[PDB]
Design a protein around this ligand. Structure first.
Ligand code: HEM
Ligand SMILES: CC1(C)[C@@H]2CC[C@@]1(C)C(=O)C2
Length: 391
């Protein structure tokens, strides 16, 4: 599993961290990563795992590298292996103004999900709420029928969690097979939904091609799935384990957006990277062309150099700082929609199921990867203390 130490890596910089299976996984995935942020670890280290790659362990380095796109390419952001124009278009379809308009329907969606659970006194929140939410949101956002969810959720599940029935290419191809006819059909048309708007979008002074539309539509679908699913889960895990914070938000529901932000820092989950386009000396380390560098979005907000008592969750935290949504020219297009889903989920949950907790004897498991997450989250609660609220 350890790749041979390349000629240019000095030994004092070798810290073999497996981003797919960290040593302290059972303490929590963020805690497992924050081992890179111990006093004795350099700001920039080399791991021999996963082919051999760099890791920036600090907020300064992470931010700087995502700003320095000329040295640090997004051609290969995954370990192991006019953009502004495409972003402007995507932002037409998920920007704040679209999110603002949809809030109402996002809230209806959330409420019937929680309502269909509320009387149970128990659920697997990850499977029962968190999974079916962001996919349904995308259907809403994209004027797609609910009946299309089972086949569509299957394809996206194959890209990140294959059962072996489809290779990534096959699943990719089938997603496109599904999208193309809708794009071509709505291109002809003044539809106000997200596919229509992407379909009919202009790029480089010409119209977007069908191949380009299906590609952006594809990333909008898949980028807003596992991230949200897992982030919601970390958040609910925390609240389940912490009644004081649960009551804090019950007593002051206007604090919820600041909590969201604090939880985004504390339960950050994405770890992407870049590839060096040429040799480059960076913070006193010789990087070599072709080197891949992990630049863990997760780490910035957990760096004590950026937030005091980084592992402590405080909703009154004065200067919340994090790159949970990335940094630089690829900063998440879906962050606004994500925030809304987070806030809406918490408000609509808490005002319905104020008291709840982890099933007794169950131990929550985390997994670690590009998008870290939660295996399962069993909750229990007494239905007598819940309530119903309709829209
Ligand atoms: C809490 C949930 C989310 C987190 C933590 C998050 C995290 C991010 C991060 C860190 C990046 C940049 C990766 C890089 O620089 O290589 C990003 C990019 C992106 N995300 Fe988000 N994401 C979230 C939700 C969303 C949602 C809701 C959507 C779409 C609806 C979205 C779609 C995108 C797309 C299309 C990109 C690529 C932007 C570009 O390449 O220019 N993700 N995601
Ligand atoms: C890691 C991601 C899920 C996040 C959104 C899509 C994705 C593959 C990225 O490029 C950033």
């Amino acid at each position: 599993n350890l790749a041979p130490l390349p000629p240019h890596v000095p030994e004092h910089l070798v810290f073999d961290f497996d981003m797919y299976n960290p040593s302290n996984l059972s303490a929590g995935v963020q805690e497992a990563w924050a081992v890179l942020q111990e006093s004795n670890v350099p700001d920039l280290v080399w791991t021999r795992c996963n082919g051999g790659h760099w890791i920036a362990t600090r907020g300064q380095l992470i931010r700087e590298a995502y700003e320095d796109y000329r040295h640090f390419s997004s051609e290969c952001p995954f370990i192991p292996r006019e953009q502004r124009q495409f972003r402007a278009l995507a932002n037409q379809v998920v920007g704040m103004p679209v999110v603002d308009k949809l809030e109402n329907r996002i809230q209806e969606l959330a409420c019937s999900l929680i309502e269909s659970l509320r009387p149970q006194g128990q659920c697997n929140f990850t499977e029962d709420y968190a999974e079916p939410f962001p996919i349904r949101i995308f259907m809403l956002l994209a004027g797609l029928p609910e009946e299309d969810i089972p086949h569509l959720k299957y394809l996206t599940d194959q890209m990140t969690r294959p059962d072996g029935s489809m290779t990534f290419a096959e699943a990719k191809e089938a997603l496109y097979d599904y999208l193309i006819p809708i794009i071509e059909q709505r291109r002809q048309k003044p539809g106000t939904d997200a596919i229509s708007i992407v379909a009919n979008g202009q790029v480089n002074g010409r119209p977007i091609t069908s191949d380009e539309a299906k590609r952006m539509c594809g990333l909008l679908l898949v980028g807003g799935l596992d991230t949200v699913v897992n982030f919601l889960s970390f958040s609910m895990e925390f609240l389940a384990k912490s009644p004081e914070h649960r009551q804090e938000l019950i007593e002051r529901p206007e604090r919820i957006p600041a909590a969201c932000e604090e939880l985004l820092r504390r339960f950050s989950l994405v770890a992407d990277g870049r590839i060096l386009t040429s040799d480059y000396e960076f913070h006193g380390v010789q990087l070599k062309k072709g080197d891949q560098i992990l630049l863990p979005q997760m780490l910035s907000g957990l760096d004590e150099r950026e937030n005091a008592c980084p592992m402590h969750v405080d909703f009154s935290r004065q200067k919340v700082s994090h790159t949970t949504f990335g940094h630089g020219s690829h900063l998440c297009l879906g962050q606004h929609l994500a925030r809304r889903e987070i806030i809406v989920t918490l408000k609509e949950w808490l005002t319905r199921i104020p008291d709840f907790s982890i099933a007794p004897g169950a131990q929550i498991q985390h997994k670690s990867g590009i998008v870290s997450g939660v295996q399962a989250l069993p909750l229990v609660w007494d239905p007598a203390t819940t309530k119903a609220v309709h829209h």
